[PDB]
Design a binder for this molecule. Sequence first.
Ligand SMILES: CC(C)C[C@H](N)C(=O)O
Length: 232
Amino acid sequence: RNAIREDLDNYLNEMGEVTADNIQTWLSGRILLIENAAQNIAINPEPAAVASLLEQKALTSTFMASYLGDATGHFTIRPDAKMPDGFDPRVRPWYKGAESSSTSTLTEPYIDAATGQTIISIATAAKKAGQSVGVVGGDLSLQTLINTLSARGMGYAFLVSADGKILVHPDKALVMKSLKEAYPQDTPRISSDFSEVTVDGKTRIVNFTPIKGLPSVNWYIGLSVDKDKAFS
Ligand SMILES: CC(C)C[C@H](N)C(=O)O
């Protein structure tokens, strides 16, 4: 094994890059739809126009919901949903995220005010010549992200922030845990090209690949493979 080790490294690196590239491409189109909705909203922000934009099938078929929230606390959501009493878009993570960035952004997983399930959102400020008229967002379910990741018997991919927080993992118990909390006995390190760590009495090899071309966030694909199966 100390002969083909540099070999295995090359396969694992290649698989990480491919997986990162797929997820980037999958997210990019969705990012573009939300940006386009924001650009269009900024053309005419009257609520009738906004509603009509947000009701179109390209958006409603791609996102669980798409919406605009503004600095007065008003919001429009399509498809319409009953929101909790007192719902204020200004305090929600999609809104504060977009307001803190010069470009589009993606949230970490959070609890959806609409459905009560764990989601991420894509969001961007809708600007008319330098002035923001509000924040436009769209929601994607965790289950959707988990399925996108498990699509492509050595091992599996997961998504982790560059702060070391697991964002999306096929084991749902590890969602939104730090690497340390998720792997307490022997912790993989994003600062290492490869981490050999024992899980349930087996050696796994873990590497991390940056996902290029996302706006505002720096996230990695983690790959974890059984060390015997990989060598075999
Ligand atoms: C705007 C709404 C559809 C809900 C949004 N995802 C939230 O939790 O704030």
